Amino acid sequence: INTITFDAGNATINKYATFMESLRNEAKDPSLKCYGIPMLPNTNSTIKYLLVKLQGASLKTITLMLRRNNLYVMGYSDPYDNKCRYHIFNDIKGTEYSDVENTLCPSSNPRVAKPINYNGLYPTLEKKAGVTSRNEVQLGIQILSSDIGKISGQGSFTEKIEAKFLLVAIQMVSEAARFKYIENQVKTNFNRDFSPNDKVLDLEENWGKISTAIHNSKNGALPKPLELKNADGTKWIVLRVDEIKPDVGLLNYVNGTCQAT
Ligand SMILES: Nc1ncnc2c([C@@H]3O[C@H](COP(=O)(O)O)[C@@H](O)[C@H]3O)n[nH]c12
Ligand SMILES: *[C@@H]1O[C@H](CO)[C@@H](O)[C@H](O)[C@H]1NC(C)=O
Question: Are residues 7 and 119 in the same domain?
């Protein structure tokens, strides 16, 4: 469908809230839903990818390409030297690789490869970025805008700022779309840089666990206790779908029927 665009250079809470709502309605399987939370399609949807264009205050752009089944950033393009430059992780290959290369930068127009010489897993990204953990990498709307400027159209940039930009972009686009809690952490701190708290990391880490739990619930009761973390890192025991439902924007795909509402 339509490329979804977010202008980070000229943002408001309301435009970012709109962007989330957009991304969530385009990503979701139109029919699937459990306890009223929309669920992503499986890997045989009629449309398998989503493109997301971001703009900085410099007016430079970066377009991310997400796999729609699990909202995974597979790679990105920028305008470079009158060419479309595509950057793809080193583990995307064959039919996926050439749907990504050709949808970010079509055949009929000039393009040039610039590999991401690592994979898109958080550990790998933390390592290139030089941090033990991603709570050391700050997030925010100015940071996202500044980061687009540091890479878009630049002949040379380090793998450290590229991995920092991808830690920020995966969390403010993909994690924020999966979790309404992370979207509300960006709006709360809209006008500042912030470090993700311990509930933000735990939710990221447990999205699959959470999706399967809700999908598998009977009359609103979770199959077993779910132990997550509060904003201060203390333990939180979830027993019922409506204790976690305020924080979840989308569900990972889980096979089978579930209570739809
Ligand atoms: N490049 C990327 N894009 C989106 N999500 C992720 C992730 C993490 O990816 C997981 C996605 O789930 P899968 O196990 O279905 O691949 C989420 O738990 C998310 O925290 N790592 N790298 C990612
Ligand atoms: C998916 O779920 C449907 C309905 O329960 C079932 O018939 C099918 O066997 C499942 N597929 C897989 C791979 O388990």
Answer: yes
Domain count, the chain: 2
Task: Give the nearest ligand 1 atom to 207 CA.
Answer: 18
* Residues 160 and 193 grouped into a single domain: no
Same domain, 135 and 242: no
In this structure, what CATH number is given to the domain that contains residue 212? 4.10.470.10
Q: For the chain, where are the E strands, in sequence order?
A: 4-7, 33-34, 37-38, 49-55, 61-67, 72-80, 83-88, 111-113, 221-229, 235-240
Q: Which residues line ligand 1 (CB under 6 A)?
A: 70-73, 120-122, 170, 174, 204-205, 207-208
Last residue of a domain, one of 177, 195, 224: 177
| Cβ neighbour number for residue 199 with a 10 Å cutoff | 21
From the CA of 183, how far away is ligand 1's center (Å)? 17
Report the largest interatomic distance among the alpha carbons of the chain, rounded to a whole angstrom.
58
Domain boundary among the residues 177, 202, 230 is at: 177
Instruction: Look at the block and give the residue holding tokens 């957009």.
Output: 22
Question: From the CA of 203, which ligand is nearest?
Answer: 1
Minimal-distance CA residue to ligand 2 atom 7: 256
- Name the experimental technique: X-ray
Residue-number span of the structural domain to which 12 is assigned: 1-177
Q: Classify 148 as helix, strand or coil.
A: helix
Which residues' Cβ are closer than 6 Å to ligand 2?
255-256
Contact assessment for residue 85 and residue 114, using Cβ atoms and an 8 Å cutoff: yes
Supply the CATH number for residue 86's domain: 3.40.420.10
Question: Which among 254, 202, 212, 256 is positioned nearest to 233, based on CA atoms?
Answer: 202
User: Annotated catalytic, 243?
Assistant: no
- Which is catalytic among the residues 101, 126, 162, 175? 175
